[PDB]
A paper describes a structure:
The pro-oncogenic cellular activities of [name] alpha (ERα) drive breast cancer pathogenesis. Ligand-dependent transcriptional activities depend on the association of coactivator proteins with ERα to form functional complexes. SERMs and SERDs elicit a structural rearrangement of the ERα LBD to sterically preclude binding of coactivators in the activating function-2 cleft. Activating somatic mutations near ERα helix 12, [name] and D538G, enable hormone therapy resistance in metastatic ER +breast cancers.
We solved x-ray crystal structures of antiestrogens in complex with [name] and WT ERα ligand binding domain (LBD) to understand the structural basis of differential transcriptional antagonistic efficacies. RAL, BZA, and RU39411 showed the greatest efficacy of transcriptional inhibition in MCF7 cells with WT/[name] [name]. In addition, a new hydrogen bond is observed between S537 and E380, which was previously computationally predicted for the [name]-BZA structure. This hydrogen bond is not observed in monomers where crystal packing forms a hydrogen bond between D538 and a symmetry mate arginine, pulling 537 S away from E380. BZA, RAL, and RU39411 show the greatest burial at 379.75, 377.87, and 325.21 Å respectively. Of the structures, RU39411 (SERM), RAL (SERM/SERD), and BZA (SERM/SERD) demonstrated the greatest transcriptional inhibitory efficacies in WT/[name] [name] MCF7 cells. These molecules engaged a new S537-E380 hydrogen bond that enforced a well-ordered antagonistic H12 conformation that corresponded to significant surface area burial within the AF-2 cleft.
Author numbering:
A (entry chain A): 307 to 330, 341 to 529, 532 to 550
B (entry chain B): 307 to 330, 341 to 459, 472 to 527, 530 to 545
Amino acid sequence: ALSLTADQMVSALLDAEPPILYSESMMGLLTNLADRELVHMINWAKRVPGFVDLTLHDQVHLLESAWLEILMIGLVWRSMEHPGKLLFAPNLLLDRNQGKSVEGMVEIFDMLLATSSRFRMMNLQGEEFVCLKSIILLNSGVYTFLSSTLKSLEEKDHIHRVLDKITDTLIHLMAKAGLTLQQQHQRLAQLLLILSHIRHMSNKGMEHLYSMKNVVPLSDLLLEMLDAHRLH
Amino acid sequence: ALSLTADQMVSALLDAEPPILYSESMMGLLTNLADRELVHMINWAKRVPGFVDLTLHDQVHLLESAWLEILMIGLVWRSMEHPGKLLFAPNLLLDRNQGKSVEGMVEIFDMLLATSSRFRMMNLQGEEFVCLKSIILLNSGVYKDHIHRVLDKITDTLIHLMAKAGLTLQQQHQRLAQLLLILSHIRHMSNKGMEHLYSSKNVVPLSDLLLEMLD
Ligand SMILES: Cc1c(-c2ccc(O)cc2)n(Cc2ccc(OCCN3CCCCCC3)cc2)c2ccc(O)cc12
Ligand SMILES: Cc1c(-c2ccc(O)cc2)n(Cc2ccc(OCCN3CCCCCC3)cc2)c2ccc(O)cc12
C-alpha cells in the first residue's frame, strides 16, 4: 500500500469502483437504493489500499463516520452532467421540485446541486474523483477515534501515510495533465476545500434523515459486512 | 490587493490577529465571552486582504457561516499547551469533566481536544494558523471569483511558508493537504456545535448584528 506508485494507486482505485445501482414513494425508493449501495460501499472500502490493514473496529468507525459523505460525493459525481438534476440512479433522475415533495429535502437538494455545479465548473476528472472519495473514507473519522492506545496511534499513523500517498497521487495526476506547479497546489487546495462543504452537507443530511427516522445500530451492520470469514 | 507578496500577506495576517479576551454559570460565561469575541472577529476579518472588496452582503454571509469555526480554531490554537484542557480564556480553563456538566457538550469538547492534539502533533506554526483561519473565513460560505482568487493566494502563501522551512516539494503538498483536511473536521465540529447551541435560535437575523458591527 505504501509502496504503490501513483499510477498504481490510480489503477487500484479505478478498479475498486462500485457499480452504479438502479432504483427498483420517492423516499422509499431512495432509502432502498442507499441500503443496497452500502454493501457495495464496503467492498470498495476493502479495496482502498491500506484500509484492510486497519483493525475491524477502526474500519467500522471510519465507515460509520463517512458513509453519507461517500454517498453524496458519488451522487454529485453522477449528477455532474445533469444540470439542475440529481442522478440518484440512471432511472431515478430527480429535480428540485421533486425534492419539495419531501419535507426538509430541497435544502439538501440545493446543496448537492451546487456541489455538482462546482465539480462541473472545475471539470473534475474521474481519476481525481476516486482519490477524493478515498480521502473521505480515511479522513472523516480519523479525529474521532476515542482511544489513545499504542495500537490506535499506530493506526492513525498508517492512515495519514496512506492519505499522504493519495495526495501524491492527486498532484501526479495534475502534473501529468500539464498543470504548472502553482496550478497543481491551487487545484489540490480547491478540491480539498470542497470536502469541507461535503462534510457540511453530510451533517445537514444526517439531521434530515433523523427527522424522518425501527433500526439495527449501524455499527453492527457495518461489522457484519466487514467482518467476513475467509471461507470464500 | 492580490498584489501582496507572500511575506506581506503573512505580515498583514499576523498583525490583524485579535486579542485574547477574559471572562469576569458556565454556559452564561461562555456565551458572554463568545459574544465579545465576535466584535473583534469582525475587525480581524476587515483586515484580511481581499475581504473588504466584497459586497457587505457577501462579507456578512461569510461571517454568518464561519464565526463558530473561527472561534473553534482559535480555541484549539491557544489550547495546544494545555493537554486535556480548553483555554476558553486565561481565567476560564476547563477540562472535559467541566464540560460534562453541560448536557451535550462533552462530545464537542473531546473533538476540540483531538484537534488540539492534532495541531500539536503537526507542530502547527503561527503563520500557518493565520492562513488557515483566513481560509475558513473565505471558504465557509462560498457554496465567487475574487474569493477564489484570494483563496488561491493564501494557498500560494502556505506553500511559500513551507518552502521556507525547508520542506521538499513532496512534503509541501503533503502538509498543505494535511492542514486543509483538518478544516473538514473543524467544519464538522461547528455543525455539531451549532446543533448543540440550538438544542433555540432568534427570530432577528445575525446578519443584522454583523452589519452593524462593521460600522
Ligand atoms: C445523498 C443521498 C440521499 C439523501 C440523503 C439525505 C437527505 O437528507 C436527502 C437525500 N439519498 C437518499 C437516502 C440516503 C440515506 C438514507 O439512509 C437511511 C439510513 N440507512 C440506510 C442507508 C444506509 C446506511 C444507514 C442506514 C436514506 C435515504 C441517497 C440515496 C442514494 C445515493 O447514492 C445517495 C443519496
Ligand atoms: C468552541 C467554543 C464554544 C463551544 C460551543 C459549543 C460547544 O458544544 C462547545 C464549545 N464556546 C462556547 C459558546 C460558543 C458560542 C456561543 O454562541 C451563542 C451566542 N452567539 C451569539 C450569536 C453568534 C455569535 C456568538 C454568540 C455560546 C457559547 C466558546 C466560547 C468562546 C470561544 O472563544 C470558543 C468557544
